[PDB]
Each structure stands twice: as structure tokens, then as C-alpha cells.
């Protein structure tokens, strides 16, 4: 009885999707194919710096005016980059529904950039990056990310090195801006309180145009990365907490046994223990991030070793159906509040080109048994080499041969 | 040689005994010697690098 995700397609190429529900407040949002995997180490730092500028300043809404219109109807604007997507994203009343889809038009296209702003966002990305460093995960994950993908775009990070954001200019911007954002490669989300046949209309007269043709034929293309298992341990003794993540590779965004390692992390001492299935696309990293005391990190790393060794060898129904009710309750959906199911929206079409029904997800999940589960867990876990990333009091944090033998149960 | 036989009745079984301790040892040396640079390769690859903050 969940209604359907109708998804349409412009000439542009913008995929213009939508979703309704009683709900009033509807999240229209902007999503674009366009991370730090798509920079070439000399534009590391475009996408976020135009994420922290694109707000500020637009060609028809000069300075600050676009923030004051969303201030007139009460709206919230919000904005994200990850290294696969960048989001722009309102959350409005659903009578405000045409104003808002024109704000998004603005901040699309027609951006301006005011070489002026471009400084003021350079000391306030530099300043953060500066005290970035504060958040440990953040840094544990970056860590993770770079050793795991050493000498692709997808060890880089979102912010960039601090070089290429102190060197940027409104052109190198521009470049990005007019290279990154074409409108085969966007989707226009909406989920609440919205009609899709309005959402269309509204999406041609402000959307329209967005640009399609590359520069001299220069249209990008991607590199399948490459999963360097290898460690990096950033020792600072002075620090109270050490934050240690170990990953394997994972398969991807189209590959659904995903489902089934979600499971796996839904069956899984050390302060926090969270389990993550960073999935990027074509690739990912399935794995841990345990924060601990420096005199016990080394027994965490054998507990969250024998547990997986445990789903690789041993794993039970009973568990495998907690795994599953548990999954089945991260299902997102209106209740979940329009933000979320906005953003899986536009997730899903810019990922699996099409939205996935919660019922295709059921189905998915109940066809998971224990036998499968402890099968593609062998497949993605057992004898795989890691990527490890430690920061903090990190000497007990065990080297390379012993974590990777411990991938191994003599025993099997 | 007879004398020589006495004094080790043993010679020729031995001989026999160090050839085939030589073609164990020409065959496990280069395989034990590989088995240890693996394990510690991952040293002798190891980068440090020092980021004073
Ligand atoms: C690790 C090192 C393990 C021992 C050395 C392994 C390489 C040599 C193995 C024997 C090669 C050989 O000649 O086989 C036939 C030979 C016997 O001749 P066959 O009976 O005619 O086959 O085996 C031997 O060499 C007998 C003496 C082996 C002594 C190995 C040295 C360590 C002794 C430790 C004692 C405690």
C-alpha cells in the first residue's frame, strides 16, 4: 500500500522523480553524479568549495538573497557532498512548491560565484579544515579510505588537500561547475506533499536547459578502483581514545548481496563498535570502526575478528533472523519523514537508475537464509586482506600479519 | 680401502643420506627464505613519515 516512486525523464537528461503523501512538508532536492571521484588531484577540493559557495551568491539572487527568500516561507536549505553524489536540498510547505523548485533552478545554474565569496569560503574551508582534524572518525575513515584506495580518485577526500583549496579559482570552479553538472547526470527528487504532473511542470520551466554538452568532447569517464589492502597507523600518544577501522572490499551499489551483508552487519567491548558497508560504487569497504583505550584495541580486533570468522563458519538461523528483522527496520520510508525518503530518491536514481519498492526490499530480504549468508561472508571476508586505519594510542594495535592471519581459523 | 671400510662401515650409506640432505636443503632454503620475506616484506615496505602539527 506504499504508493509508487514515479520517476520521468527530460530532454535535458535530468531525471525530474517524485513521491506523495499526506505529508505537507515536501524535501525537493537536487541530486548530481558529481564527488571527489570525479577530480583530478588538481580540483580536489571543487565539489565542496561550490557546496560551501553555491548558497552564497547566485547570479539572480545576488549575495544573500536567496537565503532570505528561503528565510520568507520558513524553509530549511540544506547541502552535502560525499566522493560519489552532491545533494542541494529544500524542506518546505508544499503550497511554497513552485518558488522552491526555482530556488533549486538557481543554485544549479545560474550560480555566481563572487570572486569575493570565493575568498571568504577559503578561510572559512581552510579554518575548518584546520580544526577538522579534531574529529577523529572523520580522520580514521579519511585514513581508511586513502590506504585502502592508495594512487585512485577514491582515496582522495571530499575536503581535498589544503593546497587545492587555498588555490582555487572562480574558473577552475566554473570548470567543475559546467564539467559536473550535466542533466543526463541529475535527478530531481520530491517526496511528501507534492504532485508529480506539477513537479514536471515546474521542472521544465525552471529546469530546463540545464547544460548536456561537454567541452570539446572532453566527456568524463571512470576508473574501477583498486582495493590496496594496507594499513596506516597515525600514532599521537597524547590523544585519550584510539578510533581503529578495518575493512574489507566491498561489491558495490548493483550487487545484491549487499542485502545479505547487510544482514551480517545487522548480526554484529571497545567503547563504540559500529559495523559500516561503505559502498561506493563498483566498489566498497565493508567492515568496523572501534574506538577504544589503547590496552584493549588489541583484544577488540580478536573479538571483531572471531565474530566474522563466526559468520564465515557458524552462522544459525536464529541469528540470521535477527539479522533480517533488524534490516527490516532500517526500511525508509514516510514515517522515516520526507528528508529521508527524499534523499533515497534521489539516491536510488542516481545509483541503480530507478527506485527500489520497500516490497522488492522485503522480498530481497526474506529470500536471505543462514546457508547464503555464511557463503557470501566467506566470500567477502574470509582470508581477504584489510585496510587499517588507527589514530590515537595505537602501539597495541596489532601489525599487518596479525590481523591478517587472524582472518584465517585454522580450524576453519 | 678395506681398512678405510672398517673403520666406517657406514661411508657409503651416509654419502647417500647427505645427498638426499643436500637436495632437501637446495629445495627448502629458497621456500623458507621466501616464506620469511613475505612475513617481512610488510616491514621492509613500512613508510614513516613524521607530521608535527
Ligand atoms: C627444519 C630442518 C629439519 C631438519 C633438516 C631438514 C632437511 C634435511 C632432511 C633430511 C634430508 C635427507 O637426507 O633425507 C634422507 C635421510 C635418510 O636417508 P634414507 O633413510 O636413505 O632416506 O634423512 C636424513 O637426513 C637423516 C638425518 C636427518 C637429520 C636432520 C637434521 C636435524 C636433526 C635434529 C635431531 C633432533
Redesign the interface.
Known amino acids: 500500500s506504499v504508493p509508487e516512486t514515479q520517476v520521468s525523464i527530460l530532454d535535458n537528461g535530468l531525471r525530474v522523480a517524485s513521491e506523495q503523501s499526506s505529508h505537507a512538508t515536501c524535501t525537493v532536492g537536487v541530486w548530481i553524479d558529481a564527488g571527489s571521484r570525479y577530480e583530478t588531484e588538481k580540483n580536489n577540493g571543487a565539489g565542496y568549495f561550490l557546496e560551501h559557495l553555491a548558497f552564497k551568491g547566485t547570479k539572480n539572487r545576488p549575495g544573500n538573497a536567496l537565503e532570505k527568500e528561503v528565510e520568507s516561507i520558513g524553509a530549511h536549505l540544506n547541502a552535502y557532498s560525499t566522493r560519489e553524489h552532491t545533494a542541494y536540498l529544500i524542506k518546505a510547505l508544499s503550497k511554497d512548491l513552485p518558488k522552491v523548485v526555482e530556488l533549486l533552478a538557481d543554485i544549479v545554474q545560474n550560480s555566481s560565484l563572487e570572486d569575493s565569496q570565493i575568498e571568504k569560503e577559503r578561510d572559512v574551508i581552510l579554518r575548518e579544515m584546520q580544526e577538522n582534524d579534531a574529529s577523529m572518525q572523520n580522520v580514521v575513515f579519511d585514513y581508511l579510505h586513502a590506504t585502502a584506495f592508495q594512487g585512485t580518485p577514491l582515496a582522495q577526500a571530499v575536503e581535498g588537500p589544503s593546497e587545492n583549496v587555498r588555490r582555487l579559482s572562480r574558473t577552475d570552479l566554473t570548470d567543475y561547475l559546467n564539467r559536473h553538472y550535466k542533466a543526463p547526470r541529475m535527478v530531481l527528487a520530491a517526496a511528501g506533499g507534492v504532485e508529480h504532473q506539477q513537479l514536471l511542470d515546474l521542472a521544465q520551466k525552471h529546469l530546463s536547459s540545464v547544460s548536456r554538452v561537454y567541452e570539446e568532447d572532453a566527456v568524463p569517464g571512470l576508473t574501477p578502483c583498486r582495493f590496496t589492502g594496507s594499513e596506516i597507523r597515525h600514532r599521537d600518544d597524547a590523544l585519550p581514545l584510539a578510533h581503529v577501522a578495518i575493512a574489507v572490499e566491498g561489491p558495490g551499489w548493483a550487487n545484491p548481496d549487499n542485502v545479505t551483508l547487510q544482514v551480517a552487519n545487522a548480526i554484529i567491548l571497545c567503547q563504540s563498535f559500529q559495523t559500516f558497508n561503505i559502498s561506493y560504487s563498483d566498489t566498497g569497504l565493508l567492515g568496523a570502526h572501534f574506538v577504544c583505550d589503547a590496552m584493549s584495541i588489541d583484544d577488540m580486533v580478536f573479538f571483531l575478528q572471531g565474530q566474522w570468522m563466526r559468520l564465515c563458519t557458524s552462522a544459525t538461523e536464529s541469528e540470521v533472523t535477527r539479522g533480517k528483522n533488524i534490516l527490516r527496520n532500517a526500511l525508509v520510508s514516510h514515517l522515516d519523514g520526507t528528508t529521508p525518503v527524499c534523499e533515497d530518491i534521489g539516491r536510488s536514481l542516481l545509483t541503480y537508475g530507478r527506485r527500489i519498492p520497500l516490497a522488492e526490499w522485503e522480498s530481497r530480504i526474506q529470500e536471505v537464509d543462514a546457508q547464503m549468508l555464511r557463503d557470501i561472508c566467506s566470500k567477502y571476508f574470509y582470508d581477504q586482506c584489510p585496510a587499517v586505519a588507527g589514530y590515537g594510542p595505537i602501539e597495541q594495535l596489532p601489525d599487518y600479519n596479525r590481523i591478517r592471519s587472524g582472518m584465517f581459523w585454522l580450524r576453519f | 680401502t678395506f681398512l678405510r671400510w672398517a673403520s666406517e662401515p657406514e661411508h657409503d650409506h651416509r654419502k647417500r643420506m647427505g645427498l638426499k640432505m643436500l637436495l632437501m636443503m637446495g629445495l627448502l632454503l629458497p621456500l623458507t627464505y621466501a616464506m620469511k620475506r613475505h612475513?617481512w616484506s610488510?616491514?621492509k615496505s613500512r613508510k614513516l613519515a613524521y607530521?608535527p602539527?
Do not use: A, E
Open positions: 612475513k610488510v616491514l607530521r602539527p
